[PDB]
Amino acid sequence: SIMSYNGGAVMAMKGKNCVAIAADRRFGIQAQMVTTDFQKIFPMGDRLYIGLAGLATDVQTVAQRLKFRLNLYELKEGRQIKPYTLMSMVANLLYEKRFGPYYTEPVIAGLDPKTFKPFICSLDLIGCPMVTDDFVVSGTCAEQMYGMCESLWEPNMDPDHLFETISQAMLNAVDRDAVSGMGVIVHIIEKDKITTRTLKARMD
Amino acid sequence: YDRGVNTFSPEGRLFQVEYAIEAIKLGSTAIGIQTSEGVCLAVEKRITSPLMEPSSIEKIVEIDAHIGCAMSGLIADAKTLIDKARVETQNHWFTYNETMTVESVTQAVSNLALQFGEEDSRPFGVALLFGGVDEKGPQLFHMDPSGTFVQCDARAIGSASEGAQSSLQEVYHKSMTLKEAIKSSLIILKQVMEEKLNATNIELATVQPGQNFHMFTKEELEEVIKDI
Amino acid sequence: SSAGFDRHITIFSPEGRLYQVEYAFKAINQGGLTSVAVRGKDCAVIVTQKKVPDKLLDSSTVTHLFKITENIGCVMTGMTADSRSQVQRARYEAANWKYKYGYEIPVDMLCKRIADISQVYTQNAEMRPLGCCMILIGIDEEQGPQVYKCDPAGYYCGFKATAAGVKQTESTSFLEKKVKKKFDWTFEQTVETAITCLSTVLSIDFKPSEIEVGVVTVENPKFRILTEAEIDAHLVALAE
Amino acid sequence: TGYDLSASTFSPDGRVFQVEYAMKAVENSSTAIGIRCKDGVVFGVEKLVLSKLYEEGSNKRLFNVDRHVGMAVAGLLADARSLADIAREEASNFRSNFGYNIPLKHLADRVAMYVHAYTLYSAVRPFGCSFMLGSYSVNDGAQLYMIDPSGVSYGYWGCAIGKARQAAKTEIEKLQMKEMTCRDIVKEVAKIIYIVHDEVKDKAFELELSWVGELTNGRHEIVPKDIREEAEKYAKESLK
Amino acid sequence: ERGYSFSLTTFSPSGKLVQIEYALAAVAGGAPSVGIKAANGVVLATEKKQKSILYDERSVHKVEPITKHIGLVYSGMGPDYRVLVHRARKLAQQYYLVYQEPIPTAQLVQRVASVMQEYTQSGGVRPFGVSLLICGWNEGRPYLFQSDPSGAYFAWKATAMGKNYVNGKTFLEKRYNEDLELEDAIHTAILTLKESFEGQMTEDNIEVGICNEAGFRRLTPTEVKDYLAAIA
Amino acid sequence: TTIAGVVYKDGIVLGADTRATEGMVVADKNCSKIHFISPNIYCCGAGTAADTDMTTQLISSNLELHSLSTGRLPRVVTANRMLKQMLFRYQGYIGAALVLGGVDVTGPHLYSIYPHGSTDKLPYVTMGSGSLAAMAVFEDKFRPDMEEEEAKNLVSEAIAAGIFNDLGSGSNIDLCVISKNKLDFLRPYTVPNKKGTRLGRYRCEKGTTAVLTEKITPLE
Amino acid sequence: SRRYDSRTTIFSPEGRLYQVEYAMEAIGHAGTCLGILANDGVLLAAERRNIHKLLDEVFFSEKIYKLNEDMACSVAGITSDANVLTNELRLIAQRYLLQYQEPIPCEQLVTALCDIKQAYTQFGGKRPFGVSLLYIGWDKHYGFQLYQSDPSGNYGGWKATCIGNNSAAAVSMLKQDYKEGEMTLKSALALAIKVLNKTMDVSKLSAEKVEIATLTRENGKTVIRVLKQKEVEQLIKKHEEEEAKAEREK
Amino acid sequence: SYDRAITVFSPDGHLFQVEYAQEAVKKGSTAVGVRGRDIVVLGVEKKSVAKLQDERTVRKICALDDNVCMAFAGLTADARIVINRARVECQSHRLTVEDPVTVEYITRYIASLKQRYTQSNGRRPFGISALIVGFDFDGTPRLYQTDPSGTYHAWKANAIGRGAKSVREFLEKNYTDEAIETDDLTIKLVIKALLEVVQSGGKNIELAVMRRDQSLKILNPEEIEKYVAEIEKEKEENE
C-alpha cells in the first residue's frame, strides 16, 4: 500500500502527571533501509510534542506547514498554544486537502500549560480527532501495538514505571514488524524536566 | 483644465495626435529618395559631445534583408515599432514561405500606431521612412504618428523638413540613377545641418534589386564626400 | 462648512455632516405626495392618495401600493423611477429567504436587508443614493402587526403611526396627539383615524377615487387592496 | 454651478439635472402619437422631409419589437434603435425560457429598469429617447405604455411625444376611443397630426402609420397603402 | 460596473489625514455612551432617545452581542454601525471553525480594527463614522477596548464617547477606582449618563448590557427600572 | 455504527453507540456520535467520520450566525435546508448520513438525511451499519404518543439490538432527550459490556530495559 | 472621474515629489524611539505618548513588536498603518523559514519590506505609508545589527539613531558621546536614559513614560527582554545621582 | 486597477514627467566613469557619510554578474529595484543562450524596462540614471549610460549627478590617448575630475576598478590618500 512504502510507528501513553511518546528510527524504501536516524517526533513548544507516521514526504511536509502556522499564532497572540487547540489546528490543515490528502497520521502528546494535565489524541489522514485517556498508536504495525497496551497499561503510573511500560510495548511490537525497527527513541515529558532516551533494540 | 487623452478639438482634429506631429520637428533630419535603380536613404547623427562614441547611435536600421528604415523625432519609442515590424515579417515568412511586401509591412505598423486609451496610453512620437524592394520594384513609404502612410518619391523628414522639401522638388526627376541620387541627397544635407559634413556626422544605406540591404561604412562613404 | 468636493460626492464636511444624503431626503418631496400608515390592535392600514391629472391616462396603473410577498405589502414615496427599482429588490430578497431558509421572511428582517443595500450607495463615492422612501406592513406571529420605514440613508425603525412625504411633519404632529390619549383601536377605527389624518392635513374632504388603501389583519393575513365600493363604505360612515 | 455635470450628484434642492437635460432633447424630435381603439392600437408618426435627396421609407421612427408588440420613438435616433435592440432581445429570452409570448406589463417593466440603470452612475449618460409600446392579445385586449428617459412607465388611452405634446393631446381627448374600432381611428389619427406643425416651420412632411389588433390577427404591421390614402384623402377637409 | 481605484484620503501639507479628522467630528456629534470595567465584569451603557412617541423603542437595539461572551456598543452614525457588526459576527465564526474555541476579546479587536484601516486607504470610499466599545470576559479577567475610525485601538479602564465626552472623562476620573463590583459599576454608569441626558431618564431612554463570567447579556427593561430607581 | 431517533408525545429522543472501527480493528471505544447544532437541535452522524464532523460544525456555525441576527430561536426546517443544499452540491462525494431532530416553535421534527441529498420527515428513523437490527425493534414496538419513559426504554432497546447483532458496533449507549423546555444530554446511559479483569501479574520493575543514551533537560 | 483624482504619484516641477515629504513631515512629530549598540546586545528605548491615568497597560509592550524568534522592531508614525506593516514582514520571515529551514538574516528582511513600501510611492495611485521604523536583531553572518527604514523606501545600517520629535537634537548629542565597540550593555543603558532626558520636554523622567527592551544573545536563545517597570526607576535615579555630583564638582 | 495616463504630451511637443525626472537625477551624488584598454575605472564622489556609522550598506557600485559592474545616481529607492530586476534577466539569459551576458544586451533590457514604463498607465517614470561598465567576451572594455526616458548610449568617459556638466566639460579637455596608458595613471584622471567637483577631499571619494578578469575591487582609504598625495604633488611641482 501507500502507508507501507516507508513504514513507521508512533505510540503515546498517558501517565499520572506525565506523558510519554515513542517512535522508531528506520528510514527506508520498501525493502531497503537508508538511514537509522530519521526524525519523526517534532517539538511544538515546551511540554508539547507531535509524532508523525506514514509517507516520508508528508512527514517532512506537514511538520513544516504546521510550524509555519504555529509561529504566526504565538506571535499574533501573546501566549503558548494549548494542547487541545493544536488538535483543531492540525485537523483544519489536513481537511483542506480533502481530495489531495497527505498520507500521514499524527499523534499529539503534551501537558496543559496552566494546570499541568496530560493530553493525548490521534488523527486519521483527513482529520478525525480522537481523544483517549490511556494510549494512542499510529503506523503500519498498529495491531501489534494494541496487544501490548491493552495488557500492560495501568491507570496511575509514576514516570519510572511509565517508561518501562512504553519501552516494553515498543520493543516487542516493532520486533514483530518487518518494515519498522532499527532503533527506538523515547521522550517522556513532565512539568519539571524532560527526558529523551534511546533504547537498545534489534538492528536485525 | 485637464482634458482626456481622447478628446476632439472644436475644429475637430484631436489634441495629442496633433501634438505628436509637433514632436517630430525636434528630431534629426532624414532624406530618402526612390529611384528605379534602387532606394537611397540617408540621415544625420547630430553629435553632441567629442567624448561621445559616434557609431553607438543609429537611425537607419533594417527590418528584413530587403527592407530598411529611418527614424526621426523621439528614438526610445521607435525601438518598439521596429521590433513589431521584424516579428511581422517573420510570421509572414513562416506561414506563407515568401517575403512580405513593403506596403503591407507599413500598414501592419500603422494599425498599431493609434491604439492608446484607458482599457486593456499616448501616441508614438516618431516618424518613419520605409525603403524596400519588393516584386513591384523599389518602393518608398512614409508613415505618421497619426497612422497615415502614403508612397512618396522623395521625402524629407526631420527638423529641416520644409527647407529640404523645397530644395528636393527642384532636383528630382523620374529618370534618376542611384549613383547621382546619393550625391543629390548629400548636397541637401550639407546645407541644412549645423556642423561641417564629414564621414562621421552622417550614414547612408541603399537597397538594390540585385543585392540585399546594404549599409555604407566609413571607408566607401567618403569618396562621395570628396567627390561631392 | 464645506471643503473639497464634499458638496458633490459622499464624503465628510468639516462639520461632520455629509450633504449628498441630506440633499436626497428632499428629493422625496418632489413627488408632491404623502402617505400615512397606522398600526392597530389586530391590523395595519396603509392609506395614500393618488393624483390623476389626465383623462387620457389609465387610472389602474398609478398604484403606489405594491405587493412584496403574499403577506407583505408596501407603499412607495419619492420619485417613481427609483421607487419601482427598489420594489424589484424586495421581491427578489424575499424569494431567496424562502429558498435558503424554508419559511416566510419576517418583515423586520426584510427591512434590514433593504437598508443594508441602501447603505452601500452612501458608502461608495460613485453611486447615487436612490432618493425614495419605503414603508412596509405585515403580520408576524407572537408580535401582531408591525410597521417599518426605510429611508435612503440606510436607517430604519419600527413605528406605531407613520407619515412620509410632503406633509410629513404636520401629519406626525396630528398622530402623536391621537395616540397619546390611548384609545383602543379596532379595525374600523384605524381606518377612520388614518383617513382623517390626511383629510385634515391636506384639507380636501375627498370622494373615493383619489385615495387607495392597503390592509392586513389577523384573520386574513393576505395583503389586500380595497375596492372603491368598500372605500366608499368607510367614507360615508366617516361623515356622521 | 457644478451640480449638473454628473448623473450621480443631487442638486442642493434635490433633483438630477442630467436627466432633465436629456428630457429636453426629446422636444426637438418632431411628433409621435398613438391612441388605442376598442380592439387595437394605432400608432402615428409625422415624418419630416429634411431634403429631397432622401428616400421615401428611410430612417423609420417606428419599429417592430416582437410579433405582436410595436414601438414608436421620439428622441435621438441612435439611442432609439439601441433600446429597440435590447427590447427585441428581452422578448426572445422570455419565450425561450417560459414558452409563450411576453405580456406588456412585464415587457415595459424590463425595459424601463434598463433605462433607469443609466441614471445612477457617472460612467454613463441617460438615454435621450422617449417611446411608446402597444400591442393586442386575445386574452388581454389592447395595451399602450410609454417610457420617458427617466424610467417611468404608465398606461394610457392615448399619448403623444415630440415637439407639440400638449398641442397634440388637446385634441385626443375630443375623441371617443372607448367605442371606436380601429378603422375610423386611422382617419382620426391622421387628422390631428395635420392641424399641428404649420407650413411655416416645415416645408413638407410624411405620414407614417402603424396598426395592430385582431383585425391584423394580433400581428403588428404597417397599414396598407390604400387605407392611408383615404386618410390623406381626409387631409384637406380640416381647412373649413 | 467597476469602482474608482484611487484613494480620496491624502496627506495635508501640514501632515494630517483630513478625512479622518472630519470623521471624528461625526463621532463627537453622536449619542453619549459610557463603559466601565470593575473587577468581575464590564458594564456598557448608552443613551437612546426616540424623537417622538410614535417610535417603537423595542424594535432596534444599540447594545449588541457578538458571541456568547462579547458585547459591543457605539457612538457615531446609525447605518455604518450595522455594517461592521455583521462583519464582526462573521470574523468570530472563522476563528471558531479553525480553532474550536471562542475568540479572545483582544483578537477580535485585532481584526475589526484591521478592517477599518483597510477601509480608510482603499480606493473610492470614505471612512466609517463610528467608534466602538468592546467588552468581554476571556480567561477570568475582563476586558474593555475602544476603536476609532482611523483604525487604532486602546485598552481603557473607563471611558466615554459621544457628546460631552470631555466632561464624562473628568467625571469618571473623580469616581472610578480599582475596587468595585459589577452592580456598583452600574450605579456609577447611570450617574455619568445623567450628566448629559434630558429631564426624564426612564427604563427605555437608556440601554445597559453587562458581562460576567457567565457571559455577555443585555438587561431587560424591568430591572433597568430597578437600577434607575434609587439613583442620583 | 447504530443511530436512531423517535418522536414521543412531547419531544424527541436520540440515541447512538460509541465505537469507531478502522478496518476491522476497534480504534475508539468512546466516540461521541451525537453533536450540537443549536440549543434546541442536535444531530447524529454516521458514515465517514471526518465528513460528518466538518459538516455538522459548518451548519452549526451558520445557525449561530443566523439566529443571532434574527434575535430568535432557530427552526428545524432551516437546518434541513442548509444540509440538503450543500450535500447535493458535492454530488455525494461527502459521505455523511445524518439524523436531525429538534423542537422549534412548531413542535418536534425529525429528519433523516442521506449523503446524496435526499431527505424525509418521519416519526422514527435509523441509520448506520446496524440500522436494520434497530428498525426491527421500532417496527415491532412503536406506538404514537408515548411518554418519555417509554421512549427512553424503546430507543435504548433498539440501540442494544445493533450492539449484540452487528460486528461494527457495541459499547455504552448514549441518549439525548429534547423537549419544549428541557435538554437532557447524557452519554453513559447504560453499560451493557464491561471488560474482564486481569488475572496474572505482568508487572515489571525499573531496570529491566537496556538504555543506550539518556538526556535530561530541565524546565521551569 | 479624472476631476476627482489627486495624482499622488507624479513628480513636482522642481524635481522632488510632495507626497512622501508630507509623510516624512508627519514622521517628525508623534513619537520618540532610539537604539544603540556597541557590543553584545542592542537596545530600543521608546517614549510613550498616551500617559492618561485610565489604561490597562497590556499586550506586553506598546511600540515594540517581536517579528522573528530573534529580532524585533520599534515603530513610529501612524499607528494604524503600523499594524499592517508589522504583520506583513512577520510572515515574510516565516515564508523564508518555510523555504530554507533557517532563520532569516536581519538585513534582507528589511530589503523585502522596503520594496513593498517603495511600490506605493511609484504606481497604483495610492496613499503611501506614513511609517518609519527601527530594526534590531542578530544573525550568524554579522551578529548584532541595527537598521532604520523610511517612508520613501530606503534603509540604512547604523549604530545610534533616533526618529523622535527632537531626533535632530538627539543625534547631535549621540555623536558627542559614544565609543566604537566599547559601549557595553550597561553604559549603553546609562547613555540611553541621558539622551531621552534631553529630548523629552516633560521633565524628571517618569518611569512609566518610557519603554526599554534589550536583545541579548544566549547560546541558542537570543533573549529579547522587555525590562519591567521596577528596574527602570533605579536606572533613572542612577542618572540623577551622578548629575548632582558632576554639576557641583564643576 | 488604477488605469490612468500619467505622462502626456505638451502644447509644444514635450513630456512633462520625463523632463521633471531628469532634474531629480541632477541632484544625486556625482558618479564618474572612464574606460581604458585593459582596465576600467569608475567611482562615485560625494560619499557624505555620517563618519560614525555603518558604511557597507550605503554602497552604490554593485555587480549584476561577474563581468558587469553598475553605478548610478538619482534617488536610491527607485534604483535598487531596477538592479534586482536586472539581476534576474541576466541569470535567465544563462538558462537560455549559454554565454555570459554581453554588456550591450543588459543595457537594452534596462532601457526597454524604462521606456515601456513611461508608456504604461498609472506609473510615474523612473528617477535614476546609470552607468553600466563591463568587459565582454574577447576582452573589449566599454561602458554605457541610461537616460530616465530609456535611451542607452555608449561613451568613452562620462559623469552624471549633481555637478555633472562642469565635470563633463572638464573631461573632454583632459581625456587624451596617453591618459589611458597605465592603469594607475587612469585612476588619477578620475581623482582629478572628482576633486574638480563637489568637495571630494579623499574622504568622500570611493573608486573601484576592474582588470577584465576579476570581480570589482574597492580600494580602501589608503590608496585614495596615496593617489591624492601624488596627484596634488604632481600639481604642486608643475604650477
Curated annotation (Swiss-Prot), chain A:
Pfam families: Proteasome
Single Gene Ontology BP annotation: proteasome-mediated ubiquitin-dependent protein catabolic process
Record-level GO cellular component terms: cytoplasm; cytosol; extracellular exosome; nucleoplasm; nucleus; proteasome complex; proteasome core complex; proteasome core complex, beta-subunit complex
PROSITE patterns reported for this sequence: PROTEASOME_BETA_1, PROTEASOME_BETA_2
SUPFAM superfamilies: N-terminal nucleophile aminohydrolases (Ntn hydrolases) (SSF56235)
Residues with PTM N6-acetyllysine: 76
Chief place where the protein resides: cytoplasm
Subcellular localization: Cytoplasm; Nucleus
UniProt KW ATP-binding keyword: no
N-acetylserine modification, residue list: 1
Disulfide bonds: none
Induction of the gene: Up-regulated in asthenozoospermic sperm.
Record keywords, A-Z: Acetylation, Cytoplasm, Host-virus interaction, Nucleus, Proteasome
Quaternary structure note: The 26S proteasome consists of a 20S proteasome core and two 19S regulatory subunits. The 20S proteasome core is a barrel-shaped complex made of 28 subunits that are arranged in four stacked rings. The two outer rings are each formed by seven alpha subunits, and the two inner rings are formed by seven beta subunits. The proteolytic activity is exerted by three beta-subunits PSMB5, PSMB6 and PSMB7.
Family annotation (PANTHER family): METALLOPROTEASE TLDD (PTHR32194), PROTEASOME SUBUNIT BETA TYPE-3 (PTHR32194:SF10)
Family named by the database record: Belongs to the peptidase T1B family.
Protein name, UniProt field: Proteasome subunit beta type-3
Organism: Homo sapiens (Human)
Swiss-Prot record, chain B:
PROSITE patterns (alphabetical): PROTEASOME_ALPHA_1, PROTEASOME_ALPHA_2
Upregulation: Up-regulated in colon cancer cell lines. Up-regulated in fetal Down syndrome (DS) brain (at protein level). May be the target of the transcriptional activator NFE2L2.
Subcellular localization: Cytoplasm; Nucleus
Main localization, broad class: cytoplasm
Keywords in alphabetical order: Acetylation, Cytoplasm, Glycoprotein, Nucleus, Phosphoprotein, Proteasome
GO biological process: proteasome-mediated ubiquitin-dependent protein catabolic process
Modified residues (Phosphothreonine): 48
Glycosylated position list: 185
Positions carrying Phosphoserine: 9, 49, 56
Record-linked InterPro entries: Ntn_hydrolases_N (IPR029055), Proteasome_alpha (IPR050115), Proteasome_alpha-type (IPR023332), Proteasome_alpha_type_5 (IPR033812), Proteasome_asu_N (IPR000426), Proteasome_sua/b (IPR001353)
Family in the record: Belongs to the peptidase T1A family.
Assembly with partners or alone: The 26S proteasome consists of a 20S proteasome core and two 19S regulatory subunits. The 20S proteasome core is a barrel-shaped complex made of 28 subunits that are arranged in four stacked rings. The two outer rings are each formed by seven alpha subunits, and the two inner rings are formed by seven beta subunits. The proteolytic activity is exerted by three beta-subunits PSMB5, PSMB6 and PSMB7. PSMA5 interacts directly with the PSMG1-PSMG2 heterodimer which promotes 20S proteasome assembly.
Protein name: Proteasome subunit alpha type-5
Organism: Homo sapiens (Human)
Swiss-Prot record, chain F:
Enzyme Commission (EC) number: 3.4.25.1
Tissue specificity comment: Expressed at a low level in colonic mucosa. Up-regulated in colorectal cancer tissues.
Location of this chain's protein in the cell: Cytoplasm; Nucleus
Keywords: Cytoplasm, Host-virus interaction, Hydrolase, Nucleus, Protease, Proteasome, Threonine protease, Zymogen
Active site residues according to the UniProt entry: 1 (nucleophile)
Cytoplasm recorded as keyword: yes
Reactions catalysed according to its record: Cleavage of peptide bonds with very broad specificity
CC annotations in GO: cilium; cytoplasm; cytosol; extracellular region; ficolin-1-rich granule lumen; nuclear body; nucleoplasm; nucleus
Main localization of the protein described in the UniProt heading: cytoplasm
Keyword Ribonucleoprotein: no
GO biological process: proteasome-mediated ubiquitin-dependent protein catabolic process
MF-aspect GO terms: endopeptidase activity; threonine-type endopeptidase activity
UniProt record similarity statement: Belongs to the peptidase T1B family.
Function: Component of the 20S core proteasome complex involved in the proteolytic degradation of most intracellular proteins. This complex plays numerous essential roles within the cell by associating with different regulatory particles. Associated with two 19S regulatory particles, forms the 26S proteasome and thus participates in the ATP-dependent degradation of ubiquitinated proteins.
Name listed for the protein in its UniProt record: Proteasome subunit beta type-7
Gene: PSMB7
Full protein: residues contained: 44 to 263 of 277
From Swiss-Prot, chain G:
Family: Belongs to the peptidase T1A family.
InterPro entries: Ntn_hydrolases_N, Proteasome_alpha, Proteasome_alpha-type, Proteasome_asu_N, Proteasome_bsu_CS, Proteasome_sua/b
Reported induction: Down-regulated by antioxidants BO-653 and probucol.
GO BP annotation list: proteasome-mediated ubiquitin-dependent protein catabolic process
Gene Ontology, cellular component aspect: cytoplasm; cytosol; extracellular exosome; intracellular membrane-bounded organelle; nucleoplasm; nucleus; P-body; proteasome complex
PANTHER family, A to Z: PROTEASOME SUBUNIT ALPHA/BETA (PTHR11599)
Listed SUPFAM superfamilies: N-terminal nucleophile aminohydrolases (Ntn hydrolases)
Modified residues (N6-acetyllysine): 126, 175
Gene: PSMA4
Record has S-adenosyl-L-methionine as a keyword: no
Domain of life assignment: Eukaryota
Keywords: Acetylation, Cytoplasm, Host-virus interaction, Nucleus, Phosphoprotein, Proteasome
Principal subcellular localisation of the protein: cytoplasm
Reported function: Component of the 20S core proteasome complex involved in the proteolytic degradation of most intracellular proteins. This complex plays numerous essential roles within the cell by associating with different regulatory particles. Associated with two 19S regulatory particles, forms the 26S proteasome and thus participates in the ATP-dependent degradation of ubiquitinated proteins.
Localization, UniProt: Cytoplasm; Nucleus
Stored Pfam families: Proteasome (PF00227), Proteasome_A_N (PF10584)
Protein name: Proteasome subunit alpha type-4
PROSITE patterns associated with the record: PROTEASOME_ALPHA_1, PROTEASOME_ALPHA_2
Residues recorded with modification Phosphoserine: 12, 74, 172
